[PDB]
Structures are given as C-alpha cells and as structure tokens.
Amino acid sequence: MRDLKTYLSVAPVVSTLWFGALAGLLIEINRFFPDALIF
Amino acid sequence: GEWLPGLASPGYLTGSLPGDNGFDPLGLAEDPENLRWFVQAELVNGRWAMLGVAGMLLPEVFTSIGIINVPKWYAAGKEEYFASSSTLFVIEFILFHYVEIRRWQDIKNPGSVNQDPIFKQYSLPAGEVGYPGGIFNPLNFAPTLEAKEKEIANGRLAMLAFLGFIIQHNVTGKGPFDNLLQHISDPWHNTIVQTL
Amino acid sequence: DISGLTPCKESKQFAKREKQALKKLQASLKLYADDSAPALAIKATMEKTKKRFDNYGKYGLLCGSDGLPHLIVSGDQRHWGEFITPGILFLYIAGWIGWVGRSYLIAIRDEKKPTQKEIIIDVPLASRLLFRGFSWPVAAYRELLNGELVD
Amino acid sequence: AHWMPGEPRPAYLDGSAPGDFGFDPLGLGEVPANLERYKESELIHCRWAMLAVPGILVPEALGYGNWVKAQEWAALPGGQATYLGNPVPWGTLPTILAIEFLAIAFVEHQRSMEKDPEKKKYPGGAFDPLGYSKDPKKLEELKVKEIKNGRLALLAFVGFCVQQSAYPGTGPLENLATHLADPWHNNIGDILIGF
Amino acid sequence: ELSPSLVISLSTGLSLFLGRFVFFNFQRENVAKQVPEQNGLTHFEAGDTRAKEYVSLLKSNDPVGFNIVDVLAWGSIGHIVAYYILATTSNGYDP
Ligand code: CLA
Ligand SMILES: CC(/C=C/C=C(C)/C=C/[C@@]12O[C@]1(C)C[C@@H](O)CC2(C)C)=C\C=C\C=C(C)\C=C\C=C(C)\C=C\[C@@]12O[C@]1(C)C[C@@H](O)CC2(C)C
Ligand SMILES: CC1=C(/C=C/C(C)=C/C=C/C(C)=C/C=C/C=C(C)/C=C/C=C(C)/C=C/C2=C(C)CCCC2(C)C)C(C)(C)CCC1
Ligand SMILES: CCCCCCCS[C@@H]1O[C@H](CO)[C@@H](O)[C@H](O)[C@H]1O
Numbered sequence: 001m002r003d004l005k006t007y008l009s010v011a012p013v014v015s016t017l018w019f020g021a022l023a024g025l026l027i028e029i030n031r032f033f034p035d036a037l038i039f
Numbered sequence: 040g041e042w043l044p045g046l047a048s049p050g051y052l053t054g055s056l057p058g059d060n061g062f063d064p065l066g067l068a069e070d071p072e073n074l075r076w077f078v079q080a081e082l083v084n085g086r087w088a089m090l091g092v093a094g095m096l097l098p099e100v101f102t103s104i105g106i107i108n109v110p111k112w113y114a115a116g117k118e119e120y121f122a123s124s125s126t127l128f129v130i131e132f133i134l135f136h137y138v139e140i141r142r143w144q145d146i147k148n149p150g151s152v153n154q155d156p157i158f159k160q161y162s163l164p165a166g167e168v169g170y171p172g173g174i175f176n177p178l179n180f181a182p183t184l185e186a187k188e189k190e191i192a193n194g195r196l197a198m199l200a201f202l203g204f205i206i207q208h209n210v211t212g213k214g215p216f217d218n219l220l221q222h223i224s225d226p227w228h229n230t231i232v233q234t235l
Numbered sequence: 236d237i238s239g240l241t242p243c244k245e246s247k248q249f250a251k252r253e254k255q256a257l258k259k260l261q262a263s264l265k266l267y268a269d270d271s272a273p274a275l276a277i278k279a280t281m282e283k284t285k286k287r288f289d290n291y292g293k294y295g296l297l298c299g300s301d302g303l304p305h306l307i308v309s310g311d312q313r314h315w316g317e318f319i320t321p322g323i324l325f326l327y328i329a330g331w332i333g334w335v336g337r338s339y340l341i342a343i344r345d346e347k348k349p350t351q352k353e354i355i356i357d358v359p360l361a362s363r364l365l366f367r368g369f370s371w372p373v374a375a376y377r378e379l380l381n382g383e384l385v386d
Numbered sequence: 387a388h389w390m391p392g393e394p395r396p397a398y399l400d401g402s403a404p405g406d407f408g409f410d411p412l413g414l415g416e417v418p419a420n421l422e423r424y425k426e427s428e429l430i431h432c433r434w435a436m437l438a439v440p441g442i443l444v445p446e447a448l449g450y451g452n453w454v455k456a457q458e459w460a461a462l463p464g465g466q467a468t469y470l471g472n473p474v475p476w477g478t479l480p481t482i483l484a485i486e487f488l489a490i491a492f493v494e495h496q497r498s499m500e501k502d503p504e505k506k507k508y509p510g511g512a513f514d515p516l517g518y519s520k521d522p523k524k525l526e527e528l529k530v531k532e533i534k535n536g537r538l539a540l541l542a543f544v545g546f547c548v549q550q551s552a553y554p555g556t557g558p559l560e561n562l563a564t565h566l567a568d569p570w571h572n573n574i575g576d577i578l579i580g581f
Numbered sequence: 582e583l584s585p586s587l588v589i590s591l592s593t594g595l596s597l598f599l600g601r602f603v604f605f606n607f608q609r610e611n612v613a614k615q616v617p618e619q620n621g622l623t624h625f626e627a628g629d630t631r632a633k634e635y636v637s638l639l640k641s642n643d644p645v646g647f648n649i650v651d652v653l654a655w656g657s658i659g660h661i662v663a664y665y666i667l668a669t670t671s672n673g674y675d676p
Pocket of ligand 1: 405413425426
C-alpha cells in the first residue's frame with residue numbers, strides 16, 4: 001500500500017493527475033465563462 | 040494564543056510579541072527582519088484601517104438618526120470642497136512624504152530620529168519602534184502589553200472590516216450601515232447569497 | 236478611434252459577420268427536427284454566438300476593416316483588459332508556479348538522495364509548499380532584499 | 387549636519403568641504419579626482435545660475451518682458467534685439483553669436499589652463515578686488531554661503547524651466563501672481579493629477 | 582548681401598589667430614600625448630618606409646613653432662566656417 005502510494009507519487013502519474021485536474025478546471029471555466037478575449 | 044487549536048506555533052513566534060497567536064501558515068515572518076517590518080506594517084495598516092473604518096461607518100450612523108446630513112464615504116470626494124482634490128493631493132503627498140520618510144528612518148535606525156530638526160530643544164523619549172510616545176502620547180497612558188495587543192486586535196478587526204466595506208459596497212451599492220440595517224430587517228433573506 | 240479603428244459596437248462588418256454566422260448555423264439547422272438533439276445543439280451554438288458578439292461589443296473592443304476585434308496593448312487605460320490585467324494575472328500565476336517549484340527543489344537539496352524526490356514526488360512536502368505561492372511577490376521581494384534569492 | 391537625518395554619510399564625505407551635507411546616493415564622488423571635478427563644475431553651474439535667475443526675473447518686472455519672449459526676436463529674417471527698450475545696433479543673431487562664441491571660448495579655455503585644483507574653483511587674485519578671501523575662516527564661511535545660494539539658484543532655474551514647460555509663453559513672476567490669485571486653485575495639481 | 586572676401590578672410594584670420602595664440606599650447610600638449618604605433622614600436626620602426634614623419638616640412642622659424650601644417654589646419658577650419666556662414670546667410674530659410 002505504501003509502495004502503491006509511492007508509485008502514485010511517481011513523475012508520470014503525478015503529471016497525469018495534475019494535468020488532468022488542470023484540464024478539467026480550464027474546461028469548466030471555459031464552459032461557464034466562454035469566448036473570453038478580455039480578462 | 041492558538042488561532043488553530045491545536046496547531047503548533049511556528050518556532051519564530053515565541054510569544055515575545057503582542058498579538059502572537061501563532062498565525063503564520065505561509066511562513067512570511069520566518070526571517071527576523073521580515074518579522075520586524077511586518078510588525079510595523081501590521082501596526083500601520085491596522086491604525087489607518089481603524090481610522091478609516093471609523094470615518095466610514097460613524098458619519099453614516101449619525102446621518103441615519105438625523106443628527107447631521109453627511110454624504111457617504113464613496114460619494115464624498117465629488118466636487119464639494121474649496122481647494123479642489125488635486126491641490127489637496129499635492130499637500131497630502133508632501134506632508135506624508137516628510138512624515139513617512141521620518142518614520143521610515145525610525146524603522147531603519149531606532150535612535151536616529153527623535154529630536155525636532157528645527158527646535159532641537161524638544162525631543163522624544165527613547166521608546167519602542169512603532170510606539171513613539173512622548174508628544175504623541177499627551178495623556179501619558181501606559182504602553183502596557185495588554186493595551187498593545189488590544190491595539191493590534193482592534194486593528195485587525197478594522198482591517199477585515201475595511202475589506203468588508205469595500206466588497207459590500209462593490210456588490211450592493213449602498214453604505215455598510217445601510218447593509219447592516221437591511222440585514223436586521225430580514226436576516227434569512229438578505230445575505231451575500233441574495234445580493235449576488 | 237485608436238489606430239484609425241472603429242468600435243465593434245459601431246462596426247458594420249462586425250454585425251455582418253454575426254449575421255452570416257447565424258445564417259450559416261440556421262441553414263444547417265433546417266434539416267433537423269426541432270426537438271431532436273442536433274437541433275438543440277445548433278441552436279445552442281447560435282445563442283452562444285450572438286452572446287459572444289454582444290459581449291465583445293459591450294467590452295468596448297475596437298474592430299478593423301475586417302470586422303474583427305483588434306487589441307490595444309500600448310498601456311491605454313481604456314483597454315487594460317486587453318493585455319495589462321490578464322498579463323498581471325498571468326505573471327501572478329507563473330510566479331506562483333516557479334516560486335513553489337523553487338521551494339520544493341531547495342527543500343530536498345540537502346538530503347541523502349535528492350534525485351529520488353525529483354522522480355518520485357514528496358506529495359506531503361508539495362502540499363505544504365503549495366499555498367506558499369499565494370504570497371510569492373511578498374516572499375520573493377523580501378528574499379531579494381535579504382540576499383537569499385541568488386548566490 | 388547631513389541632508390537625511392539618520393542616514394549614514396559616505397566614507398569620502400566627512401563634511402570638511404563647503405556644502406558637504408553627505409548627499410551622494412548614486413556614489414558619483416566615490417572617485418576622488420571625479421569628486422574634485424564635480425566640486426569645480428558644481429560651483430560653475432552655481433555661479434551661472436546665480437547670474438541667470440535674477441536676469442530672468444528683473445527684466446520681466448521692470449522691462450515688462452519675458453525670458454522666453456526675449457528669445458523670439460531671432461529665428462526670423464528681421465533679427466532685431468532690444469535692451470532696456472532701446473534697439474541695439476549690433477543686435478543681430480550672427481554678429482552677437484560670433485562675439486559670444488569668441489569671448490566665451492577665450493575665457494572658458496583660459497580657465498581650462500589652470501592646474502591648481504583650488505584655484506580652478508576659487509581663482510581669486512584679479513577676481514577678488516575686495517580681498518574678501520584674505521581671511522581663511524571668513525573664506526570658508528563665505529564659501530559655504532556661495533555654494534548654498536548657488537544650489538538654491540539652480541533649483542530656481544529648474545523651477546523656471548519646468549513651469550515654462552507646463553505654462554508655455556508665461557514667465558515665472560506671472561506664475562507667481564497667478565498663484566497669488568487663487569493659491570488653493572492655481573497650483574501644480576492641474577499639471578500633476580489633472581485634469 | 583555679404584562680401585565673400587571679407588567673410589572668408591575674417592573667418593580664416595580668426596581661426597589662425599585662435600590657433601596661433603589661444604589654443605596652441607593645448608593642441609601641442611595633446612599631440613605630445615599621442616602618436617600612432619603598432620606593437621609598441623611606431624609605424625616607421627616596424628617599419629613601413631612610407632610612414633616616417635616629415636622633419637623638414639614641419640620646421641619653422643616661428644617663435645612658438647607655428648608651421649605650414651597648422652596653417653593648413655586652422656585655415657581649413659576657417660574656410661569651413663566662412664562658407665558655412667555664406668551659404669547659410671544666402672538661403673531664404675524661415676522656421
Ligand atoms: C549639476 C551640477 C552639480 C554638480 C557637478 C554637483 C556636484 C556635487 N554635489 Mg551637488 N547639488 C546640485 C548640483 C550639482 N552638484 C544641485 C542642483 C543641488 C540642489 C538640489 C545640489 C545639492 C547638493 C547637496 C546637499 C550636496 C551636494 C554635494 C555634491 C558633491 C558630491 C555629490 C556628487 O559627487 O555628485 C556629483 C554630481 C553630478 C555628477 C551631477 C550629475 C547629474 C546627473 C548626470 C543628472 C541628474 C538629473 C537631475 C536629477 C535632473 C533635475 C531634476 C530636478 C527636479 C532636481 C559634488 C561636488 C554634496 C557635497 O559634499 O557638497 C560639497 C552634498 O552634501 N549637492
Ligand atoms: C489600511 C486599510 C484601510 C484604510 C482606509 C482608509 C484610510 C479610508 C479612508 C476613507 O474612508 C475614509 C476615512 C473617508 C472617505 O470619505 C475617504 C476614504 C479614503 C474612502 C485597510 C487595510 C486592510 C488590510 C487587510 C484587510 C489585510 C489583510 C491581510 C490578511 C488577512 C493576511 C493574512 C496572512 O498574512 C498573514 C496574517 C499570515 C500568513 O502566513 C497567512 C495570511 C492569510 C496570508
Ligand atoms: C607671414 C607673416 C604673417 C602673416 C601670416 C598670414 C596672414 C598667414 C595667412 C595664412 C593663410 C591666409 C592661410 C590660409 C589657409 C587656407 C586654407 C588652408 C583653406 C582651406 C580650404 C578648405 C579646406 C575648403 C574647403 C571647402 C571646399 C573646398 C568646398 C567648399 C566648402 C569647404 C569650405 C568645405 C604675420 C604678419 C602674421 C607675422 C609673421 C609673418
Ligand atoms: C493530498 C495529499 C494526500 C497524501 C498523499 C498520499 C501519498 S504520499 C506518498 O507517500 C509515499 C510513501 O507511501 C512516498 O513515497 C511519496 O513520496 C509520497 O508522495
């Protein structure tokens with residue numbers, strides 16, 4: 001379990017989760033505040 | 040003091056300062072000089088916030104009870120004065136330049152600035168940085184630890200209150216006391232929820 | 236106006252672009268049952284479109300002879316949202332990221348095997364250093380004056 | 387006595403020089419030779435300013451003229467100048483330009499040939515008929531007075547030029563009167579935080 | 582209208598006077614401080630046979646040493662200033 005957590009903390013997994021979260025965020029923001037060219 | 044019971048207070052907050060409740064989660068005052076400068080800044084922002092908030096709420100309360108017709112703080116600058124806002128700004132800028140540079144020199148070097156440059160006979164007694172005293176304290180109140188931490192407390196409360204005033208005016212478009220009254224009117228139907 | 240441009244709310248070509256766009260969308264919409272999903276989709280596109288043009292007009296954007304929004308980045312105060320403000324926001328976030336990363340690299344620099352925590356992230360440490368970025372201008376400004384920024 | 391109370395003065399400024407108030411934020415006088423040259427040139431700028439300032443104010447009050455309008459007679463085919471109201475015969479641009487050039491070049495270059503650093507700034511001799519420099523202590527006191535009046539004159543000149551940039555075609559004394567009109571309305575504000 | 586001869590002669594006279602009396606020492610001093618050389622030795626010591634300084638031509642029985650070269654130099658400046666003044670006063674320029 002500790003080993004599995006360590007694996008989940010490895011660079012590619014961390015990157016997939018981080019950029020996944022970011023992608024989700026930017027997507028939702030661009031869904032609620034769409035076509036933003038100013039601000 | 041424990042702002043978050045029971046979160047261990049940072050090592051650099053040993054309670055040797057008034058207002059030490061161990062609240063610095065981002066570690067801004069990890070450096071001693073940083074802690075000094077931030078103590079000064081907290082005192083100054085705090086005092087100006089107390090004065091400002093008082094000057095924002097109090098005139099409005101007296102207007103509500105019909106004592107004196109005073110225009111609200113966010114509509115007070117608009118072309119009502121004798122000397123105009125620009126001249127007022129130049130004056131303000133000059134006097135504040137002098138005063139703030141003076142205090143700054145006090146912060147950089149405590150004993151360096153204490154005597155009147157014109158009338159060198161008069162002088163200010165060697166005290167604490169941020170707590171000048173002397174002529175600034177004509178009623179000779181004792182700068183006790185309790186009084187200091189009370190000062191800092193009311194200062195923090197007033198700063199948060201100023202942020203509150205700004206945001207509330209930004210949203211509702213009325214005065215803070217007006218918002219308070221409307222909140223008293225119907226508490227469960229007049230909050231930030233309904234105004235947004 | 237600025238650079239010989241004309242305001243989008245007053246631009247004829249801007250309006251004609253909105254027109255042709257909406258008319259293209261409707262010309263495509265004609266082939267589907269009004270209650271069906273394709274219809275609702277195309278209609279959503281139409282509403283989104285006109286809302287977009289209306290918002291651009293409202294924002295005080297200047298249009299060229301092409302009928303498209305052109306941006307003013309000279310520092311002109313009527314257009315700070317066209318570069319200055321989102322620029323400040325960007326700089327804030329980027330500074331946040333860089334400062335946090337810097338903190339992390341410094342934190343593990345003095346250890347048995349530093350490279351380890353560079354290929355296997357210390358998530359507790361990272362979460363502790365995460366929010367420190369919020370005050371990055373203040374933190375960096377003080378480190379600049381102190382001499383803890385460079386060697 | 388320094389310019390900023392509580393601020394440490396540079397290592398090379400002990401205050402033994404006339405007007406030495408420890409003002410050098412940029413550390414331009416860190417080099418001794420440069421510092422000496424700066425003393426000389428500061429005195430030169432000072433004396434030029436002290437001659438200029440009243441020469442800007444006086445003909446505006448008495449001669450009813452203007453230190454900027456007094457420039458405009460040139461730059462045109464006419465080229466006629468007036469002194470105390472009286473049109474000068476040799477008062478044309480090329481002539482006075484040649485005269486000024488030759489004279490000032492001669493005197494300046496003659497000042498350039500001096501080797502003694504103390505006489506390069508304080509020549510004396512023929513330039514001191516009243517012998518006010520004969521007494522050392524009085525010389526020092528009068529030196530301090532000179533550098534101070536000179537610096538104030540320089541500041542006044544800056545005032546004239548900036549006030550001219552803000553209100554073109556109007557002299558300093560005219561601006562003083564305008565200020566005396568409505569002191570609380572006629573200020574720098576209209577230029578700074580205006581409009 | 583300005584007499585070309587008077588302007589030119591007066592200008593050249595002023596320049597030659599300035600070079601003979603008021604700027605002579607300074608010029609001679611700065612020239613004394615400078616002399617072209619490659620790798621320490623001069624161009625003639627290197628040596629290019631065509632880079633020897635003319636001793637004969639520079640000779641003069643003038644009290645200070647004002648020779649033909651100085652005459653050509655300050656004279657050149659004089660003529661330049663002269664023709665500048667002439668051409669300038671000749672035009673109908675108005676700003
Ligand atoms: C331009 C002529 C000039 C020169 C050559 C000097 C030279 C000197 N002054 Mg200074 N002084 C001047 C003008 C000048 N001053 C003016 C106008 C004032 C009134 C503000 C003063 C007030 C003053 C004080 C109180 C003191 C000095 C001192 C000195 C000496 C040490 C400082 C130094 O080394 O800087 C060398 C200076 C320069 C190399 C000048 C360069 C200027 C740069 C290139 C451009 C500056 C642009 C300017 C700021 C624009 C004007 C803006 C306007 C609004 C002010 C040095 C001999 C100190 C001293 O020991 O005196 C004996 C001292 O205590 N001066
Ligand atoms: C000075 C101030 C306000 C002053 C107001 C003035 C003069 C008002 C003047 C006027 O109204 C009058 C008088 C009359 C009107 O006619 C004119 C105006 C001009 C409108 C507010 C400060 C306001 C300052 C505020 C609100 C500061 C808040 C900071 C916080 C909460 C930071 C917390 C942390 O930093 C710590 C403590 C530790 C870290 O580790 C963690 C985090 C959380 C990062
Ligand atoms: C002897 C004698 C004497 C006399 C002397 C003299 C008088 C001399 C002179 C001399 C001279 C008299 C010289 C001259 C020279 C000249 C020159 C050297 C010139 C040059 C020129 C030029 C360079 C030109 C150029 C040009 C051209 C070509 C074109 C047009 C323009 C111009 C101008 C650019 C005496 C008595 C004193 C004394 C001793 C003896
Ligand atoms: C939001 C943070 C949640 C806590 C993070 C869970 C994984 S924490 C994880 O623990 C491993 C050991 O088991 C370490 O090897 C690894 O470096 C560390 O990131």
